[PDB]
């Protein structure tokens, strides 16, 4: 269902993040030819700090991947479904605070856009965890979207009926009359 | 959808061929080739995949 869909996409996005990050050696930064031919690492390769700090982040998203695969394959019938409320906090709180830092990473003067193989999973998982918390707060029953689409369709049906009867061809003309 | 409901007298659901004819022709050949670009530009970056 809906929460099941979110948890499934979380496990598969984190699986992809790992299977892509480690199974390849390392990325190479943009060269930016002509960038101060001296020092300050402009027009250079990468280094121990970067590589290992990143190899970490991959392990963090693995941890939350395993937490989410556990929750999915366990409470897919959503043992007892409720006291998982413990784990729920551990899956939401962290998430939002993570997002916080990311939401200010542009102000921090960081380049988050050149390398997709690292920041993508982090941003996507933060968003997924936050929307999961939101949907668990109000319990989208995976059938309430059906009621939403039916409401908008009923409105647009009421609109086209008025349009047709006012501007195209009256309903009293096109339909048959009885009794004679 | 509205005009078919008014003409045929019953709302088309996935159990009836009207729904599937509308789906295929209308949606898949008129609304999909641009909603696809909209989603591939604005909603996949909201996930991890590039």
């Amino acid at each position: 269902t809906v929460a099941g869909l979110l948890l499934t996409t979380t496990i598969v996005v984190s699986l992809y993040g790992l299977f892509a990050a480690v199974f390849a050696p390392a990325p190479a930064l943009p060269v930016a030819v002509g960038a101060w031919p001296g020092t300050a690492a402009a027009a250079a390769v990468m280094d121990g700090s970067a590589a290992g700090l990143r190899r970490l982040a991959a392990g963090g998203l693995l941890l939350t991947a395993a937490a989410s695969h556990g929750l999915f394959d366990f409470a897919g019938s959503v043992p007892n479904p409720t006291i998982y409320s413990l784990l729920n906090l551990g899956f939401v709180a962290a998430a939002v605070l993570q997002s916080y830092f990311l939401y200010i990473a542009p102000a921090w003067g960081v380049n988050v856009n050149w390398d997709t193989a690292l920041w993508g999973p982090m941003y996507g998982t933060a968003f997924l965890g936050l929307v999961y918390g939101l949907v668990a707060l109000t319990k989208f029953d995976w059938s309430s979207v059906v009621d939403a689409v039916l409401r908008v369709a009923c409105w647009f049906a009421e609109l086209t009926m008025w349009f047709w009867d006012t501007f195209v061809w009256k309903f009293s003309w096109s339909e048959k009359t009885r009794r004679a | 959808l509205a005009l078919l409901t008014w003409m045929s007298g019953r709302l088309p659901t996935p159990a009836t061929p009207e729904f599937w004819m509308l789906a295929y022709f209308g949606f898949y050949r008129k609304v999909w080739p641009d909603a696809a670009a909209w989603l591939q530009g604005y909603v996949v970056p909201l996930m991890g995949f590039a």
């Binding site: 059906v146 009621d147 039916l150 409401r151 369709a153 009923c154 049906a157 009421e158 009926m161 309903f171 | 509205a2 409901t5 008014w6 019953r10 709302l11």
Partner: peptide, 18 residues
């Protein structure tokens, strides 16, 4: 309001042919 009932039924014949 000729078409609302067909949607409320969810989010709640030419006798000469046979």
């Amino acid at each position: 309001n000729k078409i609302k009932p067909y949607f409320e039924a969810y989010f709640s014949l030419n006798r000469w042919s046979v």
